[PDB]
């Protein structure tokens, strides 16, 4: 929860938050490559008794040396008034850091 502290319910960093290198700006999950459950990871996951999740953490993070105060967020989904994205793109998030 320390890592997610400054993310809102939807996963976007809150306006006014201070972001430093490594911090999450927008949380995102991606479905694991079809090879994914390596046999090594299967046994490791089994030892701790936690099912390996179907999705991996692809979240957008602050690059090395960057960061600042979050002054804006723009979120655009598919199926909302006025917006149509390029084919295949469900939603686009932009974060302006000052």
């Amino acid at each position: 929860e320390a890592a997610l502290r400054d993310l809102d319910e939807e996963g976007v960093v809150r306006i006014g938050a201070e972001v430093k290198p490594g911090d999450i700006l927008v949380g995102r999950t991606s479905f694991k490559g079809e090879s994914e459950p390596t046999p090594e990871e299967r046994l490791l996951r089994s030892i701790f008794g936690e099912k390996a999740r179907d999705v991996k953490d692809t979240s957008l993070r602050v690059p090395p040396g960057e960061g600042g105060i979050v002054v804006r967020t723009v979120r655009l989904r598919r199926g909302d008034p006025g917006v149509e994205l390029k084919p295949g793109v469900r939603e686009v998030v932009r974060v302006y850091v000052a």
Partner: protein, 282 residues
Amino acid sequence: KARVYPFEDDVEVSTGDRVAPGDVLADGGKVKSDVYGRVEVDLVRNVVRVVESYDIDARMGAEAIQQLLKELDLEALEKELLEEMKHPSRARRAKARKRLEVVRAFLDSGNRPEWMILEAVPVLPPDLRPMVQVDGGRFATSDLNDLYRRLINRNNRLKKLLAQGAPEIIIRNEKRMLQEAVDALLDNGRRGAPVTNPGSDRPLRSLTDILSGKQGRFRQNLLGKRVDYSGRSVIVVGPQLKLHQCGLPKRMALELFKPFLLKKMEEKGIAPNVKAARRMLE
């Protein structure tokens, strides 16, 4: 231009056969040909025409050239050229020399001249001309794949036109198109117009282009490389330094030495092990 050989009974040849003087045409051997030519069997006029023409073997393309290359005895040509090296004329001795140097090259090396003509064309491993999904799920691919595709399409079409017995005009156009396609793959732009992708003026990048030039394989990746454990920043004067010293920003030094720092973080208790230490630096 034909000789006319009327026939009462059955004719032993058929239209398209090639014939030399004396070959039996029809009527059990009675009528035979006086000239060299092509047999035209007329069932209306009841006559066997032989159109005057020869069985000459003359070819076009790399097939002809490959034959002439096979028909070389390099020892013999060396002898000829050695005799030419004695001729009084300055230009004559020079020309026999240049020729003799290529011949001797093949002789010493063990290469057969006909290998300069390709029958099987190699196909580069796929990972060296990759098809990769970029960020957006979009695909980015090497130009070589299109050059190969042109080649394969034209080759397959050539196989089909041959099996279906197309006229020589069709086969010749196809064959010359096939040579150009191999040419584009190996060295594009070398001979003739550079092959381009549709709706772009950019010549496709062939194998020769990859090897040579400032951007080529030798100068870009071989005589020089991008390297790890490296960094860059703005420089500032340091009057207080001793001659053997420099100021290095700590944030730069932590990345450049990161693996060393992880091990040292293990000797001291700063992290339980190397994996935890890296996780702490993120």
